[PDB]
């Protein structure tokens, strides 16, 4: 059914910062982002924080692409999935055919990785036999090893692996290649063909993948820096506190998680672009030419002496974002012509529970009841396992429209209440059940003393239980349980 989801080529009307300064975070997010939901345990938010300072981008192409393919075992039960997300390198310079060409490789790279069936190291080797960075991973369940997740990240992509309590466990950092004086560009998947130097998960774990427009807005952390390689990530203390509004709430949807992170990233993005226009307006108000001031260190002499000491530190923080003498006309014209932001995209993937997927397929495909019946004898160990499983399935929320605006995100339950309550009681009774003809009578005794509503699913149970001519005598006494069903009023 909904086992493969890929984002589409979006084009938005991006206003300027001078018009976005009079808007709150709700107005900025609803005009620039979309939501692509796959289930309660996977969702994607894609948009564009790209904007200009005094003009509007009427055809702002979103050059990012995220995808997901959920894989199943031999019996049709989910046992893994493959996720990939790409960031279009460059583009947005005004050439639309260039933007289409960059998105063409960005979308095809994500789609070709998903449609492959090999491991992550062989899949990449085949497809790398117009640039776009990429970040992908593949998790899958092994018999004695459980979930095994192989990762892969190239460029400005970032991966963060949490557990069920939003506690950080691993991070796959981004990269930058020094190609010149201040020319740090992230490596690309297409560079893998140009160079030979290419340089155990658990249930409920949260794998979050984000683009340069997402984690670049949060508090950063330069992990490593060589002579031409820069490993960068986010401050794990600041990224943890983003989950403080989700500590006690049980089982949140991957959309709600991705919504929290994106809201915080766009909150700092909207404030950083406001601080930049407040700084430029405050510099133009001084008219430094009347006092003949051009050196950046003499401008700091002016601001610190005048009383705008916090306007100076604001300017110093941007100088570090990008002493010696540098003129004013260079930095002002540079800041005026800068583009703020990037295409922002994020995908959150929760590792499922084995029992939750065994029950999910048991509900979706009921004809497989006797096939996967002995599997319940293995997973189910206590009625706390089933109650925990169905409690998680109760709070699951899906999105009817796969792709919809982020403000008009309508969700509803992924299971009907009567479908969950009855299926829980069936599996609960099957566990409470699981020596010749004597036990053949005792099975009819426990079923007789029981008085469960909609007990017609005994035939559904008997299939799981069946897996001289005394079988006939018991099923005869089971047609006596039909009298017990007739007694039910
Ligand atoms: Mg980007």
Residue numbers in the entry: 19 to 147, 164 to 233, 242 to 364, 375 to 486, 494 to 526, 544 to 565
Q: Which passages does the manuscript contain on this structure?
A:
We solved the structures of Lem3FL and Lem321-486 at 3.6 Å and 2.2 Å resolution, respectively. A superimposition of the Lem321-486 crystal and the AF2-predicted structure revealed high similarity (0.88 Å RMSD (root-mean-square deviation) on 444 superimposed Cα-atoms). Furthermore, we were able to solve the structure of Lem3FL by molecular replacement using the short construct structure and further extend the building of the C-terminal part with help of the AF2 model of Lem3FL. Together with α-helices α14-α17, these three helices form a helical bundle consisting of helices α14-α20. In addition to the catalytic domain, we also provide a structure of the C-terminal part of Lem3, consisting of seven helices forming a bundle. Since SidD also targets Rab1 during the infection we speculate that the C-terminal part of Lem3 might have a similar function and is responsible for Lem3-localization close to its target protein. However, a corresponding hydrophobic loop could not be identified in Lem3.
Later in the infection, the Legionella enzyme Lem3 acts as a dephosphocholinase, hydrolytically removing the phosphocholine. Since Lem3 shares high structural similarity with metal-dependent protein phosphatases, our Lem3:Rab1b complex structure also sheds light on how these phosphatases recognise protein substrates.
